[PDB]
Design a protein around this ligand. Sequence first.
Ligand SMILES: [Mg+2]
Ligand SMILES: [Zn+2]
Ligand SMILES: [Zn+2]
Ligand SMILES: [Zn+2]
Lengths: 48, 469, 66, 50, 49, 50, 49, 258, 115, 47, 47, 299
Amino acid sequence: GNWGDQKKAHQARAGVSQVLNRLTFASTLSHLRRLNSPIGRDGKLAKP
Amino acid sequence: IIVSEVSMIRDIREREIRIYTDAGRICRPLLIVEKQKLLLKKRHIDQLKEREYNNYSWQDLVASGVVEYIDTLEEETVMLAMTPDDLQEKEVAYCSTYTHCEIHPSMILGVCASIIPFPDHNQSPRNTYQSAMGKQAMGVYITNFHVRMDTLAHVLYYPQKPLVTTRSMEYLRFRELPAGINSIVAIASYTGYNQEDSVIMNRSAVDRGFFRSVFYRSYKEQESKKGFDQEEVFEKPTRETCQGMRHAIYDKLDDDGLIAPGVRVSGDDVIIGKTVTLTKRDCSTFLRTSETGIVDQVMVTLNQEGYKFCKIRVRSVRIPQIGDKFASRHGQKGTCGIQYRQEDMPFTCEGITPDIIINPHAIPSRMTIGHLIECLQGKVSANKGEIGDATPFNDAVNVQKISNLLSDYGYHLRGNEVLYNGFTGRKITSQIFIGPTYYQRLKHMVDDKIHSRARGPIQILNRQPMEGR
Amino acid sequence: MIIPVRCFTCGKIVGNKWEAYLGLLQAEYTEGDALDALGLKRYCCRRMLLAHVDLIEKLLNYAPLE
Amino acid sequence: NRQPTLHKMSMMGHRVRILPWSTFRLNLSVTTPYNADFDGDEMNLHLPQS
Amino acid sequence: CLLNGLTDRDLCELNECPLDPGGYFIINGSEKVLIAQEKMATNTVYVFA
Amino acid sequence: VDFSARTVITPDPNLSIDQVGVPRSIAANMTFAEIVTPFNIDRLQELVRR
Amino acid sequence: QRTKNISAISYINQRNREWNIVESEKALVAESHNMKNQQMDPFTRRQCK
Amino acid sequence: PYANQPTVRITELTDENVKFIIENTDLAVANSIRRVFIAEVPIIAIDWVQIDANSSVLHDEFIAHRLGLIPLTSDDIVDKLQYSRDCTCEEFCPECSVEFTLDVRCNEDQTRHVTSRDLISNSPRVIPVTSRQDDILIVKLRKGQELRLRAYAKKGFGKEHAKWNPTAGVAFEYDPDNALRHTVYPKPEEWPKSEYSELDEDESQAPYDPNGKPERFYYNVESCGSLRPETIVLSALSGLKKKLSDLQTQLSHEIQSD
Amino acid sequence: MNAPPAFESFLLFEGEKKITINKDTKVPNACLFTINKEDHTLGNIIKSQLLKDPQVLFAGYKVPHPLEHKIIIRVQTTPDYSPQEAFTNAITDLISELSLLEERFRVAIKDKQEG
Amino acid sequence: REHQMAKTGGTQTDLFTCGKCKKKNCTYTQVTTFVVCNECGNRWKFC
Amino acid sequence: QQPMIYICGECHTENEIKSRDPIRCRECGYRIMYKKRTKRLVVFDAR
Amino acid sequence: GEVMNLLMFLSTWDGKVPQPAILKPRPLWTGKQIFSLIIPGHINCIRTHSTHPDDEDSGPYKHISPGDTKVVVENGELIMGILCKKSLGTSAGSLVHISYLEMGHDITRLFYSNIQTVINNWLLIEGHTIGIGDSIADSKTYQDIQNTIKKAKQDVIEVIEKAHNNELEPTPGNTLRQTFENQVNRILNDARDKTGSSAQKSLSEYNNFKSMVVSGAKGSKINISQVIAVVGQQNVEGKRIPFGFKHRTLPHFIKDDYGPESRGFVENSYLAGLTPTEFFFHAMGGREGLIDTAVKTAE
RNA sequence: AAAAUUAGCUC
Ligand SMILES: [Mg+2]
Ligand SMILES: [Zn+2]
Ligand SMILES: [Zn+2]
Ligand SMILES: [Zn+2]
């Protein structure tokens, strides 16, 4: 899932590729059609 | 000359026309409206209704010039309209200049939201909680589940279909692979074990196979050449040659080293007979503690490297017991508190004992009237004998009409009925509210969370107990 | 995946009514009429035939051999 | 005890009673201090050894 | 892919179901899906304050 | 720490506010060290034999 | 292999969906026909300006 | 300081359900007889399934579960057999159980429908419900699959599990007019009259009655098909009588010992 | 995993007494009967029958805990009528009543069939 | 006038007695019914 | 004298595979094969 | 029968049946009379029930209340009033607080146990529930609510007209836009309050929402008002819905439409469903709430 | 009796 080179993996993004959650058809669909913002996790701001 | 994805934005206030063609521009289709009237006339509807017989499809509509993809950056400069007829006939002059008109308002919802019946009758937080909890519902996740060897696959025995389905989920494919059962839910406080967000299930219902699901767990293991002298191989580790060995039964598996299918297993039991030569060390995997399953099938093959690679999956019949986490389609999560036998559950004038009993106090604080509407319409649909509709914005489904229908079957127009104290047989002074309603079962079983410890294994760095069940 | 054997709430045998219900729907009847033609009075037992999904067919498509 | 221990009334002693099924139980009145909700909560249980 | 526009018959014969949406890679025998990331549109002037 | 347990919780009004409904598995798994004494040597003897 | 059951189920499904389509159309025409009066408490719609 | 002289009157006797009425009896007795109908009624049912070869598409336990729910006619056999727990022999003796065998294999191309008719019982009278209306569908087999097993049946009652639950649904109801006010209708006019209501269509509910005790209990026991309804009633009465007799004996022994 | 078996609700365990008498001390002529492996079925009818009897000042049962298969019946009679004989009389008359009801039901059925 | 500050709104009534000044004038706000003293200015709420 | 019979993946034909042997079907030739059910006393209670 | 049965669920019953409040024509006990036996020792405390009209102590009937309020306990025996959270909940001078302060801690533990074990066993006979029947109005309250909402809409339109023609003078300390927004918000809040009051006064004693709210167990008058009368304004960041697009909330509405529905005012109620636009705005409000919850938990 | 790391879910 590290969208970058192996040597500098930590410098690249994380979670870009995830394991498809095959727990129930609805979950599969939701997963295949999901988004994710690059903003840092748990940011103090609340506009985004 | 211009594909349908391109977008032209006209900036009036400042004379700038900005056209975008690059990818990613999220967009959606809308109907066109020339002056006050749609381009989607009966001709188009007729030709389209005969689709799947000749060749007619969406592309025909897009080409004919009736629909049109507007991207968000262009959506800011179009006087959209909600429904064709209602917002155009003739009234106080609001805008009278619409340019497009949405297909159906309910099409804003997503995938997990859409299966929520009457979402507009619930407070948004509960809709969101339901959206998240839907992804945790059990059922048939894929038809060819018996061929998959995935890890942690749940499957439900009798996944019925919702008695009330939204028109949108017809295309979500939910009705072919449902994730819940229609249960006769009675909102009331029978005994007390369902007071703070908890439910009382019917022991007899469970005995009959109410929500009875199954739990699979796959395993992956292959042999490899550890080193010039080190090497792994499948073989029953005997009591003499193998120095490293566990204090567990090994004869349970056959000589080949792979436990045969349909064999009772329990926690801390050998599932694969891997031994590595140093004489040999028992470097073999065991079933996780507190699993207690039965072996479904054993798969053996060769990986890319060409070594013997085998996969084993164990199934487990998970009877619904107390502590299991259920949830309706409205965010009314809860955990089965206690289970009563049919003799003890209350009953209507006829032998209809509720299958689930939620707390009444869960309704007012959370404002989930949508749940009540679902229950009423479900009772009506059951009696009539056909699935009812719960599309979000319908303008033709109110409570008064649904009640009027229900009153034509000898039932209180509001859905309440007179129950009988299961124990003594005395009527209940208050008229309980009982009806069909679609309930799910989450994967959060109790047996997967219960844990204990008394001087267990210790870490190597700081001599403190380990972490994780 | 297959029609249950008994109604969860009531207990009346309903497993032996799936083929009959399908036949009645096929010939001419409608659901609301077929259900009472089979003799399912209580609305608790009707959800068995209305809501039940028939996945065993899809399962049988994956014939092991031949 | 319940995992978020905000204030003193979040770790109180109790007398043990063993019951068949596999779930911690506790009188509802004692729910308010812990802030538990019986909607899939988890509550730790330590035992002294002296 | 090998199932491009293939009838449900062959899919069933290939131990696959016609309902599977698809659109997910198979690495090391795991279903990997790419989450659509989002960012600021390029080649457009923004005036922040 | 050892001698810890974590399980879901459910209401149970028939128990007093100071009681707690532990399961059977957890009860069996944990232990309490008790000093032998002639006042209760018989009880511990029976427990050991069991 | 699918001559019985597997084919009868498809036949019943197709006829039932056709019956549902005609049922919906008749319900629509009936709703249009019975346009005498509509006085209901539990329903409302916005009216700006 | 003694009991009462209840009367009984059947209104509808069929081979599928019985509707009767009990008058001059206490509510506790009525509801207790109900709970005995549902819970404590001896009946035969499959309880031990040994599966030898199952190539169907359902689980191994799915077959056993379903087979647990197939009713078995026990009109005159339940009274004779003894609970397996109290048997004085090893293995399921025929004196204390009824053996079943099933062996089906889909050879032809058309899918099989393994129905309860495949359960070849050893005893003549203990058979699933097919004597005199399709049969309970167990599982569907496709060419090449097979299902071989044998199961034994034993006597139980609903209290232990649902499989021993002879009654489909007991309709118990008393005082159809809300004469004792045991329920308070916020709007009595809105409620539909009970099937047993003698009250005319004008009035909504009978006038209050202070010195009024519940009598005239209406029953609609509905047999699942295992036992005949009147047989269910007789068995429930006999079982309750036996439980009281045993309790009285135990109390007598306890008092004498003291 | 810790689900108790289904036979523990009605079948006695070795050493457990079916019925235990325990005299109370707070008021004269008051005993608590404790019944193992029973439910409301066998306690409610006895409670009602004791209520019918006029010499019984107090009568009531309870279930200490639903998961436990046990019930306690409290009986308190006039000083000249011990609660034991009250219990015996209640059960005896209740058995007589059920037998009479069975006989009447049987005759009613046999008359209903072609009659 | 413009420099001033707008007075806090509320339903003035004399049905509530302020415990800080003994006066009956005060204003109530429903949302729990908060009470603000009119002259004394006692602040309280009723559930 | 048990040669650890296996079931081919797609052929659904039995095969005799012993230790230190390639895992392939006697015919066609595939790399997948499952095992056969045990012979133990698989006894369930229809509960 | 019921009195003797409930007594069985009492760990501190002395064993004596209290004299029934009504000997003839038939021995009938009262709820308060039974509940007294639960109260331990000789406690004394005074409390006011939730629905206690303020203008009752001043007038006559101070010590004999028509509404059965003014909870008075003497020698640990309930005499008047209806117990609610104000008397049994967690509040200074609540009945349990007095019991703990006067009697020992164990006495208070027994008090709790007895209260629950008796009240649930009696609830078995009584029964509690909730359903559509408890959410429907009387078909006149709907008329009042519609009239009130129409008046509110007319008033906001008049305010907008005055602002457009430059007649609304800036309120002191605020700019013209600020005073305009303040007036609109006050008008909408007043309308919502009037509708809620009308809905409340239109309920019946048998209604279950009212029972749960007055008992204070779970809910509030605002919940009922939203369920029946009208949801209300959907604010974000302490203000009305902003203009995400160019000078307008959603593509449906026209530019410069400050009207109530064009800015978030959910005119419908949860029983009668929601128009799509107000549904979206309600979603925005819920999202704001969730974000605030997360940041609070983090900080 | 075994590592480093990331992600999802939950009160
Ligand atoms: Mg919670
Ligand atoms: Zn039913
Ligand atoms: Zn025998
Ligand atoms: Zn091969």
